[PDB]
Amino acid sequence: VGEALEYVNIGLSHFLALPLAQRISLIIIIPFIYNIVWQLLYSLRKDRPPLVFYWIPWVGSAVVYGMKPYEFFEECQKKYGDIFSFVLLGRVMTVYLGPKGHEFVFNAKLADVSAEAAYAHLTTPVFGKGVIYDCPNSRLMEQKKFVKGALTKEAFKSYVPLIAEEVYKYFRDSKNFRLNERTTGTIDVMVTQPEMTIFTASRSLLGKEMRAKLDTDFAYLYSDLDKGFTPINFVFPNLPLEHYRKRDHAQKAISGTYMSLIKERRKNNDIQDRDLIDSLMKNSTYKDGVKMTDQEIANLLIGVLMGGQHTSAATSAWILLHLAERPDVQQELYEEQMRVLDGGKKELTYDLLQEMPLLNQTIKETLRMHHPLHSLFRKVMKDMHVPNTSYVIPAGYHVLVSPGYTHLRDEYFPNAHQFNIHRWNNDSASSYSVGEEVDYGFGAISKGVSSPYLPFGGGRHRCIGEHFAYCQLGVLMSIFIRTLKWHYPEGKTVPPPDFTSMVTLPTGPAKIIWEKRNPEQKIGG
Numbered sequence: 150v151g152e153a154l155e156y157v158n159i160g161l162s163h164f165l166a167l168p169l170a171q172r173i174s175l176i177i178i179i180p181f182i183y184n185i186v187w188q189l190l191y192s193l194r195k196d197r198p199p200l201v202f203y204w205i206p207w208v209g210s211a212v213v214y215g216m217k218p219y220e221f222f223e224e225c226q227k228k229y230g231d232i233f234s235f236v237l238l239g240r241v242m243t244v245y246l247g248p249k250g251h252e253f254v255f256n257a258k259l260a261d262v263s264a265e266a267a268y269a270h271l272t273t274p275v276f277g278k279g280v281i282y283d284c285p286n287s288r289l290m291e292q293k294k295f296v297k298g299a300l301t302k303e304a305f306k307s308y309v310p311l312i313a314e315e316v317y318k319y320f321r322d323s324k325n326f327r328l329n330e331r332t333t334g335t336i337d338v339m340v341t342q343p344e345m346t347i348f349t350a351s352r353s354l355l356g357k358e359m360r361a362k363l364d365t366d367f368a369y370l371y372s373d374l375d376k377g378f379t380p381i382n383f384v385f386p387n388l389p390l391e392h393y394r395k396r397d398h399a400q401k402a403i404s405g406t407y408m409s410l411i412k413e414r415r416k417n418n419d420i421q422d423r424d425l426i427d428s429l430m431k432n433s434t435y436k437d438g439v440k441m442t443d444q445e446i447a448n449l450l451i452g453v454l455m456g457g458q459h460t461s462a463a464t465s466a467w468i469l470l471h472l473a474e475r476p477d478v479q480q481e482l483y484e485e486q487m488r489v490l491d492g493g494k495k496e497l498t499y500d501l502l503q504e505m506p507l508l509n510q511t512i513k514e515t516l517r518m519h520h521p522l523h524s525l526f527r528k529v530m531k532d533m534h535v536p537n538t539s540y541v542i543p544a545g546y547h548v549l550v551s552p553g554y555t556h557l558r559d560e561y562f563p564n565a566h567q568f569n570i571h572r573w574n575n576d577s578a579s580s581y582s583v584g585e586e587v588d589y590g591f592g593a594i595s596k597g598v599s600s601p602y603l604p605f606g607g608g609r610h611r612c613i614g615e616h617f618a619y620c621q622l623g624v625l626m627s628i629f630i631r632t633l634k635w636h637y638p639e640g641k642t643v644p645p646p647d648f649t650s651m652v653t654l655p656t657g658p659a660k661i662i663w664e665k666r667n668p669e670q671k672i673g674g
């Protein structure tokens with residue numbers, strides 16, 4: 150042994166007498182070989198879920214998971230079952246597919262997992278400090294409560310005409326439409342839908358003043374900030390490049406605009422119930438008496454508007470794209486519009502939107518086939534035992550849940566790759582809590598999260614924007630259906646999703662051809 154330990158020291162010094170080319174070679178080949186050896190030893194472990202084999206250390210399965218995560222999940226499921234782990238850019242990700250996985254991740258105890266440890270670098274450089282994932286979970290819960298106070302049924306009743314006004318304004322003024330001058334045209338829906346989404350959301354949630362700013366060069370800052378909302382932030386949140394300086398500058402200037410309005414309303418004591426800014430000005434004191442700063446209010450507004458921006462814009466893009474090859478669905482939806490709105494002689498209201506089940510089923514079905522968020526993550530903070538298994542998920546791992554994968558499984562949605570709005574007949578609610586409820590701080594929500602359909606997540610991190618999204622999408626599609634027909638250019642069909650973007654938006658350019666149902670119809674103003 151003593152002689153062996155001498156030759157270890159000798160071996161260590163001979164390593165350094167190696168030619169530098171042979172040294173860097175060993176610096177590479179040794180981790181490769183050890184990674185394989187480590188995986189082979191790891192597969193022996195019975196308190197660990199199977200780990201997907203991978204050749205490149207640290208990188209792991211990043212390429213196949215990044216580009217086609219559902220195909221990746223399906224292959225891993227056949228080989229290993231519903232629980233399995235894979236390496237992703239230096240992280241170990243433990244996936245739990247299906248309703249039991251929804252339950253394991255979305256209902257995990259607060260002390261067991263942390264969303265903000267998974268997401269802080271993704272969002273904080275875009276939204277700003279002190280909100281969403283740049284704060285403890287208890288602050289997030291109350292921020293969600295504050296925002297939900299502007300998302301009441303009475304708010305939605307007031308938002309519907311404002312959103313309708315913005316859609317008609319876009320049809321009238323946008324170069325993509327100009328309905329008073331053109332009866333047919335071609336659009337890229339990943340151009341039109343982001344613009345319609347920010348116009349309708351800024352007008353209703355942010356209010357008249359902030360919508361007005363979008364008619365100026367200030368809109369360029371929104372574009373700059375929006376570019377900053379990218380999954381590259383997971384690995385490179387800050388780099389000395391113009392991309393990041395334009396983003397940071399936009400965050401400062403946009404939040405500065407929000408703060409200017411806030412401080413001006415406070416100065417004049419002009420604080421009503423007009424928008425989410427009014428609401429947060431009156432309702433943003435935490436339960437320990439600490440008040441959100443004006444900077445934090447502005448940053449929360451950015452986060453809310455930006456999250457709702459990308460999910461909603463992608464979703465209305467997918468609705469239009471699925472309907473472009475379904476003139477039968479367009480026709481059905483049009484008949485429902487004519488019946489509910491008395492041939493168009495009734496103005497659309499929030500109440501009447503609730504009397505349009507087929508419209509709401511079309512949104513529901515689009516969200517089944519196109520979950521905007523294919524993977525939701527948490528960092529594991531304490532060792533977690535997987536029930537009915539011998540598995541223990543150790544702290545330092547991440548858990549990954551994918552309701553969007555199960556949305557596309559035949560076992561839960563027969564013919565899952567068929568767009569069929571009638572699978573939701575007499576089940577047209579955006580979601581339906583069936584039994585026991587629980588309040589994490591922002592209102593009672595469903596205690597169970599085992600539904601195979603979870604477009605809005607569940608548990609403490611559940612979306613609070615579901616009813617706003619349905620309101621916004623409902624008004625927008627109601628008007629689209631009543632005003633236009635649309636179809637594909639010859640030989641085109643629904644594009645595949647881009648799974649590497651911030652949401653699973655359509656791979657572009659995704660073009661449709663519209664035509665006015667009434668070429669003589671004029672939009673005033």
Ligand code: HEM
Nearest residue numbers: 453456457460461525604605606609610611612613614618
């Ligand atoms: C069709 C549209 C949308 C879909 C499918 C959707 C989906 C989701 C999902 C799956 C989650 C859970 C995230 C997780 O568990 O990690 C979530 C959370 C959230 N969403 Fe949405 N969302 C949509 C629109 C919106 C809108 C319009 C807003 C704002 C008005 C919004 C704001 C939020 C917020 C504040 C959270 C809470 C994040 C947390 O607690 O960690 N979402 N959303």
Ligand SMILES: CCN(CC)c1ccc2cc(C(=O)NC[C@](O)(Cn3cncn3)c3ccc(F)cc3F)c(=O)oc2c1
Nearest residue numbers: 281380452453456457460522524525612648649650651652
């Ligand atoms: C490369 C592919 N991969 C795998 C690594 C990706 C890619 C992008 C993402 C984005 C995610 C994401 O943006 N989550 C945050 C969000 O929940 C979104 N959101 C909910 N409702 C509306 N927006 C949120 C919640 C609250 C809010 F105030 C703003 C928000 F933005 C995510 O979770 O995972 C990802 C995984």
Ligand SMILES: OC[C@H]1O[C@@H](O)[C@H](O)[C@@H](O)[C@@H]1O
Nearest residue numbers: 299304422423424425427428
């Ligand atoms: O969002 C518009 C408004 O909705 C109202 O019902 C809320 O009570 C207000 O706080 C909010 O400003």
